[PDB]
Design an enzyme around this catalytic site. Structure first.
Site, PDB file in Angstrom:
ATOM      1  N   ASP C 217       0.822  -1.216   0.000  1.00 32.71           N
ATOM      2  CA  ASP C 217       0.000   0.000   0.000  1.00 32.71           C
ATOM      3  C   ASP C 217       0.857   1.267   0.000  1.00 32.71           C
ATOM      4  O   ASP C 217       2.078   1.200   0.133  1.00 32.71           O
ATOM      5  CB  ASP C 217      -0.884   0.042   1.250  1.00 32.71           C
ATOM      6  CG  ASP C 217      -0.069   0.039   2.526  1.00 32.71           C
ATOM      7  OD1 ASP C 217       0.347  -1.060   2.952  1.00 32.71           O
ATOM      8  OD2 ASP C 217       0.232   1.074   3.155  1.00 32.71           O
ATOM      9  N   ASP C 219       0.159   3.764   2.330  1.00 26.56           N
ATOM     10  CA  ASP C 219      -0.204   4.350   3.619  1.00 26.56           C
ATOM     11  C   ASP C 219      -1.392   5.327   3.443  1.00 26.56           C
ATOM     12  O   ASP C 219      -2.453   4.907   2.984  1.00 26.56           O
ATOM     13  CB  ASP C 219       1.039   4.969   4.286  1.00 26.56           C
ATOM     14  CG  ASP C 219       0.819   5.305   5.754  1.00 26.56           C
ATOM     15  OD1 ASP C 219       0.232   4.480   6.478  1.00 26.56           O
ATOM     16  OD2 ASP C 219       1.210   6.380   6.264  1.00 26.56           O
TER      17      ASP C 219
HETATM   18  N1  LIG Z   1       0.970   1.649   5.657  1.00 29.33           N
HETATM   19  C1  LIG Z   1       1.504   0.830   6.585  1.00 29.33           C
HETATM   20  N2  LIG Z   1       1.836   1.339   7.802  1.00 29.33           N
HETATM   21  C2  LIG Z   1       2.386   0.515   8.713  1.00 29.33           C
HETATM   22  N3  LIG Z   1       2.675  -0.785   8.613  1.00 29.33           N
HETATM   23  C3  LIG Z   1       2.331  -1.261   7.407  1.00 29.33           C
HETATM   24  N4  LIG Z   1       2.477  -2.546   6.945  1.00 29.33           N
HETATM   25  C4  LIG Z   1       1.986  -2.540   5.668  1.00 29.33           C
HETATM   26  N5  LIG Z   1       1.554  -1.366   5.274  1.00 29.33           N
HETATM   27  C5  LIG Z   1       1.770  -0.542   6.363  1.00 29.33           C
END
Ligand SMILES: Nc1ncnc2[nH]cnc12
Ligand SMILES: Nc1ncnc2[nH]cnc12
Ligand SMILES: Nc1ncnc2[nH]cnc12
Lengths: 273, 273, 273
Positions: C217, C219
């Protein structure tokens, strides 16, 4: 399934001549009896370790070449290998050539076949009540095909990178009129007797199966027609190169076949009714 | 042969310093006693698995460097390795250099030798009634030589791709007048004490034997002559690179030596009378 | 240390999802209980052979993802792996991306981190009387980093060859204001929750530890913010490629990490007071 000794497992199956097995390479070898619902496989399966990969060797004709192609218990052989847990199957086979450039001594890794057998009695494991029709448009496992081809390159051997295998019934060799049909009408490249139904069953068993063929003759097309003695002479003369390919390939099979390059690895997903 | 524990087998022999063995790499290690008709090998042979290849480690001088070159039971060492089933033998050795460009720290994979030993007591396994005269025109195993050279390339190490090893009796080092003969008259490249009769016996045992030598000094030719302390200091300083080559090479030895690149693999076929 | 079964050893540790373990590859697998002074590791450690290399698999969240990052017994996990004798540790992790070009589906092999955790309770094994301050300027093992990158190249996968991992406490995801700080102020590249103190402890244990991260992703930065469901969906979609890298890398780890490319392999030499 019940095995003796119990708990024997393997990752790679090798089907071919008994001369392929090398006791100077294979670590911790054991002869294993694997029960099948079809009776005896062609011989004991020898399981052992090659570069940390567990390999199951099965001579399709039996040790001493006791079983002709039409008499082989194909169902027992493939069931036994699958029961041991194998994911890859390397078949090594003698074949006649129907084209000048596939010369005796050359390896061929076929990508297609034409089934002209008649008397093999079972062409499948699935006789009902679950009807199974596996797609065999691309019947060989591409991942393993390319690995066999790659090993040939590493070793400096000629390995033809495609070919259509016409599988005949035998045990007698083709007449000239039949050979003209295979060569000029069907446009087949090589000819043998053992591919079918071995490959059908391997595919139904969701195995990654590929053939490393060795051209032994030109069937009817050279001055003197093929004979059994000629085939065996060329095979024995070239078995060392076959072994070198085999033992080059096997250590790189610790992992799994790539599903998207293994047509049969999930064959049952859409084949069963 | 009788071993304790029983049934121990190996595929690759490693003869050299005890520091070559790494317990952080070698899986399922066992110290093995292998009976020979010549008494004790230099020490226990440690058998274990490296990337699925069974390796037998034998320190030719014993652990702690207890046995000088002239006192080594060469027959017991090679008999024991052969009895375990090894096909390949990698020897790792310290050597002096007789040429500027073979510098201390460089590896050398020799292709020839000149035997100037005198006191080794047995130079063969065959004292009759079967007379055996092995051809040692090309005394090293070419397959293994090229594999050692290849590993050096992969790792970025200097590995001289040929060299003539003059084997002297010792244990004292050469005088200047002797060194002038080795260098300028015989035109040898490197000098050591342990190659003969080790290689003779390996050849008679039909093993694929090659030497990975490490230059430790320039014998008499630098400002200060070679000393035992100097040789040991350079060896210990470079043993890690020796190990890296060793553990790079071994995983690729799961198979057999190529007969046509292994002069001694069928030595007995035409050597016996 | 006491294990059940007794005498279990391993060479390579794999920490990540339980889906990384493949029973079609791993030979002679055994679930092992390894006593630690810190109680239970996250789950059973499964030890078995991949191409003759002994591998210990440990799911950091437990099977079924039962343990969130903040509740993981990091000390027990690393102590247990070290007690088995592992030299290499491959961590596989999901991470968010803070830059467009690190896209979901891409692998990243980070070389740096910023610890923003708060609640992990122990950040070290050393609470006295021997004070230990390991240098973690270059906290990852370079040898293993480059091997992971190399495997990616062999397989045709995108593997970003550097990156700074900001480790947050969680379990809740970052606010936008926090993410702006990670991205624009700290200039971090990826974000996760499990790296610390796992890497601290691995370094203190003198292990060669590297992370293979998979971007799941962006975030807060895409139209819809990251969710747990999104992370898990992308991970499961890409786990097969993770396995292919893992099983490509492991067979080449039969040897030792190169000390000069393993910052932590001798960390204790100058870290203890
Ligand atoms: N955006 C994110 N923030 C923190 N840990 C994660 N693990 C996977 N994506 C994450
Ligand atoms: N010419 C040929 N016909 C059938 N099977 C064969 N196997 C080898 N050569 C053959
Ligand atoms: N100069 C030298 N002479 C003989 N044996 C040696 N081994 C190492 N250096 C040597």
């Amino acid at each position: 399934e019940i095995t003796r000794p119990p708990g024997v497992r393997a990752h790679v199956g090798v089907i071919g001549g008994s001369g392929l097995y090398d006791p100077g390479i294979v670590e911790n070898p054991v002869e294993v009896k694997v029960s099948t619902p079809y009776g005896n496989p062609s011989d004991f399966i020898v399981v052992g370790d090659v570069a940390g990969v567990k390999v199951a060797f099965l001579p399709r004709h039996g040790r001493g070449h006791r079983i002709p192609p039409h008499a082989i218990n194909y169902r027992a052989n493939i069931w036994a290998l699958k029961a041991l847990g194998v994911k890859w199957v390397i078949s090594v086979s003698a074949v006649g050539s129907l084209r000048e450039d596939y010369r005796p001594g050359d390896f061929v890794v076929p990508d297609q076949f034409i089934d002209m057998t008649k008397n093999r009695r079972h062409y499948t494991f699935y006789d009902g009540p679950v009807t199974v029709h596996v797609s065999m448009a691309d019947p060989f496992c591409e991942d393993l095909r390319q690995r066999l081809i790659d090993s040939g390159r590493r070793l400096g051997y000629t390995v033809h990178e495609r070919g259509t295998y016409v599988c005949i019934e035998g045990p007698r060799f083709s007449t000239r009129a039949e050979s003209r049909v295979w060569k000029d009408v069907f446009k087949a490249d090589i000819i043998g007797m053992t591919l079918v139904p071995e490959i059908n069953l391997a595919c139904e068993a969701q195995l990654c199966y590929a053939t490393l063929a060795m051209v032994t003759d030109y069937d009817v097309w050279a001055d003197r027609p093929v004979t059994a003695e000629e085939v065996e002479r060329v095979m024995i003369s070239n078995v060392e190169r076959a072994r070198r390919m085999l033992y080059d390939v096997i250590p790189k099979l610790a992992g799994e076949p790539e599903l998207e390059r293994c047509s049969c690895c999930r064959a049952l997903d859409t084949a069963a009714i």
